[PDB]
Amino acid sequence: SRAEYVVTKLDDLINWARRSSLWPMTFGLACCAVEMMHMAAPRYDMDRFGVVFRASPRQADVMIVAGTLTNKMAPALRKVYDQMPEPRYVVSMGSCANGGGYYHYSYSVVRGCDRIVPVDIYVPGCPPTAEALLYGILQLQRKIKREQKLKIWYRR
Amino acid sequence: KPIFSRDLNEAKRRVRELYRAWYREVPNTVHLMQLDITVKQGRDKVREMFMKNAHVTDPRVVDLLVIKGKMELQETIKVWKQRTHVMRFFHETETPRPKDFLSKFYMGH
Amino acid sequence: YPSKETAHWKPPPWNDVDILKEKAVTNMTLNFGPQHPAAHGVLRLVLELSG
Amino acid sequence: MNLYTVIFINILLSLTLILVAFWLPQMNLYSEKANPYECGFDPTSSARLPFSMKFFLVAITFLLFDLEIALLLPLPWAIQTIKTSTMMIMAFILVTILSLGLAYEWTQKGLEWTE
Amino acid sequence: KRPTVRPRSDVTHKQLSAFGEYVAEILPKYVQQVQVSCLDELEICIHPDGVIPTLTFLRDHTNAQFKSLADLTAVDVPTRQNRFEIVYNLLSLRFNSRIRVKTYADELTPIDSIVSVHIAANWYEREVWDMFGVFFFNHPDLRRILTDYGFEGHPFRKDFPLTGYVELRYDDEVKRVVAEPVELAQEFRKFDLNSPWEAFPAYRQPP
Amino acid sequence: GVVATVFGATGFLGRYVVNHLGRMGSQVIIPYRCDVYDIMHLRLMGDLGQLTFLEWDARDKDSIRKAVQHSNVVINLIGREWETRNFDFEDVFVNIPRAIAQASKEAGVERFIHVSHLNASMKSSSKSLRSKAVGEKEVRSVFPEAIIIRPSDIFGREDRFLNHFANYRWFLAVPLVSLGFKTVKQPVYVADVSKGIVNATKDPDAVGKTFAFTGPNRYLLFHLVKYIFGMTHRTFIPYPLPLFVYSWIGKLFGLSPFEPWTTKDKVERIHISDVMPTDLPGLEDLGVQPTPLELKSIEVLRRHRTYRWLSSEIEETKPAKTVNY
Amino acid sequence: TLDGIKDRVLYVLKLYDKIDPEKLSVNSHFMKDLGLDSLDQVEIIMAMEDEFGFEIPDIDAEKLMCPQEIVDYIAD
Ligand SMILES: NC(=O)C1=CN([C@@H]2O[C@H](COP(=O)(O)OP(=O)(O)OC[C@H]3O[C@@H](n4cnc5c(N)ncnc54)[C@H](OP(=O)(O)O)[C@@H]3O)[C@@H](O)[C@H]2O)C=CC1
Ligand code: SF4
């Protein structure tokens, strides 16, 4: 039809790759990492959707902030987020990470990981169910599906 | 009762030894942590922090201050304290508020 | 026969063992964690390792 | 020629993969990203500092054993000889000498890593 | 007897009273008070000079092998002259019993580190110093433990604000996590849930 | 109580402007056309409900009206260093600024702040500068009280200035017109420019004036590039190259479909010497104390070094020589 | 070489910037004359240690109030 049509199909392929394979960084701070482990466990099995963990930030796409972020930990979280190569997304799971959670009015807690890194998805709960975190991952995949970077480039 | 120093003179000796240690360590700290400051700025900051407590007259309080300063010195010597933790001594994110009465009247109460 | 250059020399030890300066051991320092698979995610184990 | 061609083709395929990998993605560079990695905290010392080796003796033993393999490898052609008695005596003596060396190191605790 | 009331036994109370008198008369130079609660928990309040002697005795003595240092804590009571009350909770496995030892300290009156007696204190004393400001003499490695690296203050003190004075955020201009004075969208609500009527006549301080 | 619409937020200077506005606590509206992924860095620059991201298109004036609906201040940072297939210098520096200014006037915005360039002149050898002068005229025609800001070269972490020069290492040697001499540069700091814009958003005296934000010192291009290569401990091999050959090289580099490394207009602006203040207010009028390049060059240039020179002190490099023309 | 000692001492005292070069003299008390502080005199002693490659204890160093005292100490 048009170069615009070809570019749209190419960007659809791009987003298919990115969303089909997204490797969360092995990163968990508190309770909520246990529900992340359970979403890894057989009953839900993240790997079925192509979501496999990787320890190195250099080989990760999505950072799942799962648990309270303290003032002593925030710089390290930002450092690993920075060292993740782009494109990179952030899913803040749990109330501690969404805002402050139970420890919102504490002297040693960052009231929301979105004060340190720009968050892509927010999963409410304390902890959120493993199914709730899986729903968050699916929502992130939909977000990646609606990207159109190449169409923006071609229009530009 | 003495924590360490019997009197203000011994406390001052301890304080001056601490100042020597920090002055010596500033260059290595800047080089190792790759700070975007100069050795002059680091040593000026050390002096400013030391002088911020120059009003104290109690030997026990001076001993506590020296102990906590030694703790910070160890934390900096070792790279436990990172660049983000060290650049907080400079407050390069603060916009100073004025001390003028009229300025305060204009902004807030 | 002493010389200007040999002046700084000294006789060797009576037993060949020399009193040599203490050798600094600089054991490598590692920040095992917090973002480590085995550090449980919030532990900064500072390890001094020799190898 | 059939070997140079295939080796060069493999090298060119790998190089083309590298070129695509480096000149396709959109790149955003800054010091915080490009800094070295160490579990989220800044390294306290360079990685070029001496890194002690606790199996140095076993390494320098591996050198000699590798040369022993060098001496043992011509056996397929050696066994094709009419002096089979001499060839067998030599092979047995060489292998037994190697075994005695390994056993002596083992007993003297050379195979144990340094602490 | 009464279904909703805890059943109480006097054998433990009498044994604890006997052992309290025993320790008090074995260490008259340090013991300032001794008491057994209605929960049956022997509690020996000593002078701060007798911490090491008292713990060494309570660990080595045959009739008191309190060999496990379950807890080392500090309680902040601002009114009294000596703000901090240091509490050691000890367990004796040989006699299947527990004891508590209390002393006091002020912001400028350190205490002797008991790391020689119990090595378990190596971190409890560090926590006490970090959270209350009580200093300990002869500690191998006294430094902060729980608070941020450059943290200034002693949070567990009652005069410390709940949310502190500082908070962190990422500042793109400097490309770092910066510490700034605390501002909250909604301030902490301190509900006044104290009734005018006294609930327990048995704890009526005289007028 | 400020509501500010920043029309070029997703850029080198827009991020700093948005950051400082958020720090001031004023509501910010970011009209964007890029992908949603490109605005994540701005996402965290404001507390809850402070920042409002809305999509927009320069062609569609309804989007411009929607962006400038409830705004008291409209900052226009739109720009581009190369002529896109759809947008050229004329469009980027005249049509879009004029449309934004007229929409803002119709909506009723109290303040309009337009950013041009120090050497923006009607007779400039550079197409971009010549278009910028016309843009200034049209903006001041359709919004007579609009403030005009004329920064010099802006240097920062994400700049196309110090980074551009340090990137000449990939080409072994540095070609310069007249070997750098006969060319005076007065670079300003991006944080200073952003602070100036934000302060002008409220300074009572700033309405209707034109400012010139320039750094403290003026360097010859040769000495500036020498200082840059000294900071990025690289081998400085300068050599002269006539402007027509330089412009041909820029033409070659400007043929890429993506973001060109350099361009004819880019070399023209690199080599045109900055003017003198000449009675324009400057940063100190708005209360920004300009920061010298010597202090803030390390934070921009440390990432261009090799391992050997990565951990070198700011004082290990000889400062440039500043002219007084 | 006491003259060389005194020349190095003056060189370091002039390379120090708080003092006033013209007013700086071999007979100028750091505290009373030049106006230096305790910490300033500590930095002066550290600079002298740098120049002479020699350490100085605090007990000995607290008295080096003037350059002549410094050179007399270096005589050691
Ligand atoms: N050295 C410097 O940086 C100097 C800058 N200036 C001026 O400051 C202003 C900022 O430029 P700067 O941000 O520094 O560099 P940028 O190129 O990053 O500014 C580009 C901005 O303009 C937007 N933009 C470009 N084309 C269009 C378009 N066709 N429709 C809508 N938006 C568009 C971009 O949005 P996106 O990128 O998402 O398309 C981006 O926000 C410019 O006017 C520049 O001339 C003044 C003096 C020197
Ligand atoms: S959000 Fe709730 S469940 Fe998750 S880490 Fe925080 S307190 Fe635990």
Short mmCIF file of C-alpha atoms in Angstrom, two decimals, chain D residues 9-98:
data_model
loop_
_atom_site.label_atom_id
_atom_site.label_comp_id
_atom_site.label_asym_id
_atom_site.label_seq_id
_atom_site.Cartn_x
_atom_site.Cartn_y
_atom_site.Cartn_z
CA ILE D 9 32.58 -17.25 5.56
CA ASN D 10 32.15 -18.04 9.26
CA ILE D 11 34.29 -15.05 10.20
CA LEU D 12 32.27 -12.80 7.89
CA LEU D 13 28.97 -14.10 9.27
CA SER D 14 30.10 -13.35 12.82
CA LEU D 15 31.39 -9.92 11.79
CA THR D 16 28.12 -9.12 10.02
CA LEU D 17 26.21 -10.11 13.14
CA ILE D 18 28.43 -7.79 15.19
CA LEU D 19 27.94 -4.95 12.71
CA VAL D 20 24.16 -5.36 12.75
CA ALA D 21 24.12 -5.59 16.54
CA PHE D 22 26.05 -2.34 16.86
CA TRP D 23 24.55 -0.29 14.00
CA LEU D 24 20.88 -1.29 14.25
CA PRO D 25 19.68 -0.50 17.80
CA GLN D 26 18.95 3.00 18.99
CA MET D 27 21.68 3.93 21.48
CA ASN D 28 21.48 6.31 24.45
CA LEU D 29 24.85 6.78 26.14
CA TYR D 30 25.68 8.30 29.51
CA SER D 31 28.25 7.72 32.23
CA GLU D 32 25.83 6.11 34.69
CA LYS D 33 24.90 3.45 32.14
CA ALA D 34 28.44 2.94 30.83
CA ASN D 35 29.95 2.58 34.31
CA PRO D 36 31.18 -0.85 35.44
CA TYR D 37 28.81 -3.28 37.13
CA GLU D 38 28.95 -4.49 40.72
CA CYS D 39 25.58 -5.44 42.24
CA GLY D 40 24.34 -1.84 42.18
CA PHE D 41 27.17 -0.24 44.17
CA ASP D 42 30.23 1.46 42.76
CA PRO D 43 33.37 -0.72 42.61
CA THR D 44 35.80 0.09 45.41
CA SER D 45 38.92 -0.75 43.38
CA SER D 46 40.03 -1.48 39.84
CA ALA D 47 39.60 -4.97 38.42
CA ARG D 48 43.22 -4.83 37.24
CA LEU D 49 44.58 -5.39 40.75
CA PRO D 50 46.44 -8.67 41.33
CA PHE D 51 44.06 -11.62 41.65
CA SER D 52 45.79 -14.42 43.53
CA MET D 53 45.87 -17.88 41.94
CA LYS D 54 45.52 -20.81 44.34
CA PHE D 55 46.24 -23.51 41.72
CA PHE D 56 49.45 -22.15 40.24
CA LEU D 57 51.30 -25.40 40.94
CA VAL D 58 48.61 -27.44 39.22
CA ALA D 59 48.84 -25.07 36.24
CA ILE D 60 52.59 -25.50 35.85
CA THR D 61 52.00 -29.24 36.23
CA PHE D 62 49.38 -29.07 33.48
CA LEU D 63 52.03 -27.62 31.17
CA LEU D 64 54.24 -30.68 31.61
CA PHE D 65 51.27 -33.03 31.27
CA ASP D 66 50.29 -31.30 28.03
CA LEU D 67 53.78 -31.95 26.69
CA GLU D 68 53.32 -35.56 27.84
CA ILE D 69 50.22 -35.69 25.64
CA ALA D 70 52.40 -34.29 22.86
CA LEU D 71 54.76 -37.23 23.33
CA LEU D 72 51.90 -39.74 23.52
CA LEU D 73 49.95 -38.60 20.45
CA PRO D 74 52.15 -40.28 17.77
CA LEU D 75 51.11 -43.70 19.12
CA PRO D 76 48.69 -44.48 16.24
CA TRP D 77 51.63 -44.39 13.83
CA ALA D 78 54.04 -45.90 16.35
CA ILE D 79 52.00 -49.10 16.71
CA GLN D 80 52.45 -49.70 12.97
CA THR D 81 56.09 -50.68 13.57
CA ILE D 82 57.91 -54.00 13.35
CA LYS D 83 59.66 -53.24 16.66
CA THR D 84 56.48 -53.73 18.66
CA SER D 85 58.42 -54.91 21.70
CA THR D 86 60.44 -51.68 21.79
CA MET D 87 57.36 -49.55 21.13
CA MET D 88 55.44 -51.24 23.94
CA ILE D 89 58.34 -50.94 26.38
CA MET D 90 58.68 -47.25 25.57
CA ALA D 91 54.96 -46.52 25.83
CA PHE D 92 54.67 -48.35 29.14
CA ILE D 93 57.74 -46.62 30.55
CA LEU D 94 56.47 -43.19 29.51
CA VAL D 95 52.99 -43.76 30.95
CA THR D 96 54.41 -45.17 34.19
CA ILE D 97 56.77 -42.19 34.50
CA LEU D 98 53.81 -39.85 34.07
#
